Nucleic acid binder design. Structure first.
Ligand code: MG
Lengths: 49, 108, 98
RNA sequence: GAGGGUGCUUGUACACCCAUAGGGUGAGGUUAAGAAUUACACUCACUAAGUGUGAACAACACAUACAACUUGUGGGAUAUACGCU
DNA sequence: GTCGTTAGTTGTGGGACTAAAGGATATCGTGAACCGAAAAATTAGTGTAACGGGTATCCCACAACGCTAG
DNA sequence: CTAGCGACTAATTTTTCGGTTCACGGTCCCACAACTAACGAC
């Protein structure tokens, strides 16, 4: 589980892996599902903040 | 500020009938937008009220490392914790036709 | 959210002390979290997400152990069995997201 | 601009002024020099300060906010600036 | 008989190939010699003690009466 | 109302590494360029 942790120095995005205390990946298919539901706000929070 | 001691909004999540929720606007997305904006306003009001309540029990203790157990502050925070969340209050307001909304672009 | 409730309760005045108290796993943390959970659903997701039912919002409750408890009737939507499958939890933050 | 005067005493600040006040001088002793004159951390002393009334450098009346208000006398001791080696 | 045209190959080149987790590696071959650069280490040179008044502060102790007669 | 009375800092030197110089026996699919056999004109 991660709330905040280390980020990348290139992409400024959460790292990946339990050893790196990273965050889960919200890939393309998850974005498609979010768009299908119509959640603009949830998708926006996932994308930016 | 509405009466927070007699609110009928659910404390936790409930299966809300969408037909009732979007009956007034004809679009559930519009209803969600209106309810979210009202929830932001309700959260601001609740924050102001809670800050006013907590300023009374502002025991001026300069020490920071030690943990202070102020019973009255804990009681006030407990009272405001078990209240329905601002989005739930906004949903209850919307279902009761207590939300006023208008479109600036459409009215211009 | 637990930090906000800890500061509001007067137990702590800074973020670092609240984080330390949370990491110590005190009963106050669980008392706060029981009410913090209410009205704050989490999106459960199982990959691959073939259709939009692969992401679903569930109202969470505190349980013992380290495994997510999932409703059986949702399994058909997730194509999820219990032979070793794993799920991801995402937490909406804003009121519109909730 | 410090520092001050009046606003009971102390502290802060405050209105009104004085303020080259770490200055403007006067006298006495002493020293140096041919004199003018200079000199002394040598001694003593004088001179500035709210508004109005009032001839007036007479007198009287009026003049901001907070906090505090147990001092005085003496002894022991230390240090600062100056002078001599 | 000869030259441009069109369509159908034919060979060749450029572009795709779920999602979730994880994520450790090993990495040859040698030619000499002198000069310059700067970064570092080693060496050479100067030193107080109490006193006069006069006065700023400290600690430390004590006082801050009561009665009688002209 | 007043008076009597109980050793640190600066200057100079020296040395290892780098620079320089000399210089013989898989797949499937979609386009693009040839390209050629046949067809039509002078
Ligand atoms: Mg499985």
């Amino acid at each position: 589980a991660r709330s905040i942790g280390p980020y990348s120095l290139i992409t400024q995005q959460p790292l990946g892996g339990k050893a790196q205390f990273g965050g889960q990946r919200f890939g393309e298919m998850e974005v498609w599902a979010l768009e299908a539901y119509g959640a603009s706000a949830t998708l926006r929070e996932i994308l930016t903040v | 500020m509405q009466d927070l001691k007699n609110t009928k909004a659910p404390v936790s999540t409930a299966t809300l009938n969408r037909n009732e929720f979007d009956s007034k606007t004809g679009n559930i997305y519009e209803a969600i937008s209106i309810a979210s904006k009202r929830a932001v306003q309700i959260n601001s009001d609740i924050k102001k009220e809670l800050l006013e309540k907590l300023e009374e029990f502002a025991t001026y203790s300069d020490s920071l490392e030690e943990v202070f157990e102020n019973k009255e502050q804990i009681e006030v925070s407990k009272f405001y914790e078990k209240l329905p969340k601002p989005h739930a209050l906004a949903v209850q307001e919307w279902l009761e036709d207590k939300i006023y909304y208008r479109n600036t672009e459409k009215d211009a | 959210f637990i930090i906000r409730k800890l500061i509001e309760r007067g137990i702590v005045k800074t973020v670092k002390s609240a984080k330390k108290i949370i990491d110590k796993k005190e009963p106050v943390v669980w008392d706060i979290l029981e009410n913090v959970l209410k009205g704050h659903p989490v999106l459960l997701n199982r990959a691959p997400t073939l259709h939009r039912l692969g992401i679903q919002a569930f109202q969470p409750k505190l349980i013992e152990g380290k495994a997510i408890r999932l409703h059986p009737l949702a399994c058909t939507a997730f194509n999820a069995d219990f032979d070793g499958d794993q799920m991801a939890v995402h937490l909406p933050l804003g009121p519109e997201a909730i």
